[PDB]
Amino acid sequence: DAGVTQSPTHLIKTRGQQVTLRCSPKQGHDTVSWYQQALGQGPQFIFQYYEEEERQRGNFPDRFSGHQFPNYSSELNVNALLLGDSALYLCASSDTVSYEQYFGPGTRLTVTEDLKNVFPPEVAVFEPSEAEISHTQKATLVCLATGFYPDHVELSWWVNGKEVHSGVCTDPQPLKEQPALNDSRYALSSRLRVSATFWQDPRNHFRCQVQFYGLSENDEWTQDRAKPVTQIVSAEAWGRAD
């Protein structure tokens, strides 16, 4: 009895492969429109489905096709994947009264040259300077997530087991470790800032958590490094009195 739904959340594929994306509309909604949103660009219309047929189609090539089933859910299939198909695929549902379109959470597709290119993040917390505490009565923790590809992660901070937002800043876009290379790995920073009295309580416990979206257990893997599965990686610290 709730909102628009999409799966999978993230996908990694290689050139020439095929993918299927699923979308379920919001509960009172019976029409679903698919859009492609490339990085730094606006969503581009692919199709809209109503009563199980294609009501309208965009400007996309034959590789992209789709379907809507009796429960009003829908699939986007795209074949012969190109690197350039890397995008946020957005599904949007509407009714037939208001016709307003409400977007889902999106499937993030990345098409890469070779699955060997994917690597989870390495994660580390850096503890406050005694200088900062002294000058300021406040203490900044820095998290650093390093060496990951593709560039979708979700970074959150946890204090004494509860997820926090006040006092955080995470970089809006991750940085290329090697700008020249097209398949460069990424880095991302975040700050948690608290009062010195808070950081000085050695009962207080701080954890930086990075959810990484990676390979699924459908993906073959023969390398020696651990399979770069979708996983969570963390670093932590405890407060220090003086």
**Residues found near other proteins in the complex (CB under 8 A):** 31, 33, 35, 40-45, 48, 50-51, 55-56, 58, 88, 90, 95-106, 124-129, 131-132, 135-136, 138, 140-142, 144, 152, 154, 166-173, 175, 177-179, 187, 189, 191, 193-195, 235-237
CB closer to other proteins, 75 vs 177:
177
Contacts of 158 (CB under 8 A, 6+ apart): 164, 206, 207, 208, 209
CB contact at 8 A, 199 and 137 = no
Shortest Cβ 129–other proteins spacing (Å): 4
- What's the closest the beta carbon of residue 124 comes to other proteins, in angstroms? 5
Toward other proteins, which CB reaches closer, 166 or 222? Answer: 166
Contact 81, 15 (CB under 8 A): yes
Residue 39 CB, shortest distance to other proteins, in Å, is 11
- In terms of CB distance, is 4 or 118 closer to other proteins? 4
Rounded alpha-carbon distances, angstroms, from residue 165 to 142, 162, 204, 213: 14, 10, 16, 22
Q: Which is nearer to other proteins, 48 or 115 (CB)?
A: 48
> Least distance (Å) from other proteins to the CB of residue 220?
29
Distances, alpha carbon 106 to alpha carbons 39, 102, 122, in Å: 13, 12, 26
CB 190, CB 170: distance < 8 Å: yes
Rounded least distance, CB 26 to other proteins, Å: 12
Work out how close the CB of 77 gets to other proteins at its nearest, in angstroms, rounded to a whole number. 19
Considering beta carbons, is residue 84 or 218 the nearer one to other proteins? 84
**Residue 167 carries which side chain, given as an amino acid letter?**
G
Nearer to other proteins, 25 or 106 (CB): 106
DSSP 141-200: EEEEEEEEBSS-EEEEEEETTEEE-TTEEE-SSPEESSTTSTT--EEEEEEEEEEHHHHH
Distance linking the first and last C-alpha atoms of the chain: 53
Which residue type occupies 184? S
